Paper text:
S-layer proteins (SLPs) are self-assembling, crystalline proteins coating the cell surfaces of many prokaryotes. We determined the atomic resolution structures of all functional domains (I-III from N- to C-termini) present in the three S-layer proteins SlpA_ac, [name]_ac, and SlpA_amy. The Lactobacillus S-layers are anchored to the cell wall through interaction with teichoic acids (TA), either lipoteichoic acid (LTA) or wall teichoic acid (WTA).
The full-length [name]_ac shows differences in structure and domain arrangement compared to the SlpA architecture. [name]_ac_I accommodates a similar fold to both SlpA_II, with [name]_ac_I being slightly larger. Likewise, [name]_ac_I is structurally conserved (RMSD: 2.6 Å) to SlpA_ac_II, indicating the possible dimer formation as observed for SlpA_ac_I. Therefore, the [name] homodimer might be incorporated within the assembled SlpA layer via the two described interfaces.
Author numbering: 56 to 182
Write the structure that this text describes.
């Protein structure tokens, strides 16, 4: 009766003893220099739904942006704050430099009865 994610409405499996990569989504999110962090999070969030138990309707995953950027940074992405050119513009965070190697982003959520589900989403740099 476990909580679970879907990605574009496909049920994502658990990591199992036999298949420890059972929760790696069959997708790739591409990213490149100048991509807005908000746009990458939006792409992931549109695709991912969490289910707090086996029969529950899907709910939006809310991805913490600080956690997300720290995952990017640990995996060789450098991040820039693009500064506003005057007081009427807003700063935003964007991909600065990309690594050569793919990596997974980890997303977890806690459902009913403090049961946690985790999925891994592959990130593909374009150079």
């Amino acid at each position: 009766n476990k909580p679970y994610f879907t990605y574009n409405n496909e049920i994502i499996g658990e990591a199992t003893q036999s298949n420890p990569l059972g929760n790696v989504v069959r997708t790739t999110i591409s990213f490149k220099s100048d991509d807005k962090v908000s746009d990458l999070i939006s792409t992931i969030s549109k695709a991912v739904q969490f289910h707090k138990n086996n029969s529950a309707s899907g709910e939006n995953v809310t991805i913490n942006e600080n956690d997300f950027i720290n995952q990017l940074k640990a995996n060789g992405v450098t991040v820039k704050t693009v500064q506003p050119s005057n007081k009427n513009e807003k700063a935003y965070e964007a991909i600065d430099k990309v690594p050569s190697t793919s990596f997974n982003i980890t997303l977890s959520a806690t459902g009913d009865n403090n049961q946690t589900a985790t999925i891994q989403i592959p990130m593909v740099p374009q150079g």
